[PDB]
Amino acid sequence: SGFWEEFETLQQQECKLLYSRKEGQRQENKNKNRYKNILPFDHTRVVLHDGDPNEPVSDYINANIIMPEFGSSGKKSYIATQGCLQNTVNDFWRMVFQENSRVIVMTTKEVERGKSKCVKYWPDEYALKEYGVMRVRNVKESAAHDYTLRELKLSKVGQGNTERTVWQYHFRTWPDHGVPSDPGGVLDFLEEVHHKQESIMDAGPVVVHSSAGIGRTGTFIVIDILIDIIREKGVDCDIDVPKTIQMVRSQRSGMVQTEAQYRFIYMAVQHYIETLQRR
């Protein structure tokens, strides 16, 4: 198998000492990680400023900035993160606000097979909620076949004219096991995400999450990166899936977790190329 050996080669390259993950290992941060073994690299982690001065450690969230290229702007970058825990919802909105993120991609349900993959961090439709110092209104939900779009308005309580719209694209039909058997739904979803992000002047990085912030998160991010290369350079451009996975894995460990996800990435690229040909 060309895929198996490509994916195994990549998996071998992570069977070694990787960059430091010390902040995530601090005792004060242990309950901020869904999984003890999945921690952000220190050098690309999102550092949360402006925290409660009573909290001894208030600068940590299990999240990393992911740039597709070395000199990427914030608007062309991503934040890869885990689904919120009950005790990290407020930190998640601190992150979205601080980094000026305007689009969130959620790749799980809240619960799958009886396990929490993300605690609900948005209000019910039309409702207003306070999450720490942040205020969020769910303005409107729009349901599609594979996803729901929620138009959220985020502001900082006690600072006026900080409001901005945050568009949550919630993919809801990813299977409990494996990957979708074809990429059409994911490609249609990423096309809407991309057009929304592109339309917002000076948007910050797109936030992408899954239960650990690496498997489905890495699969969505690498597909999005590759189809943007095709968008820009056209369907005969060089595409290097292993090198792109290596680029994102230098910024958060373990991105793209399974051989089925690896094959799905190739499938999505091929279908996108085909689409650019029929229409």
Binding site: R34, Y35, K36, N37, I38, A212, G215, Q257, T258, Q261
Partner: peptide
């Protein structure tokens, strides 16, 4: 199962 580790599995 039960280790507390993420297994996408």
């Amino acid at each position: 199962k039960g280790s507390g580790d993420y297994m996408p599995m």
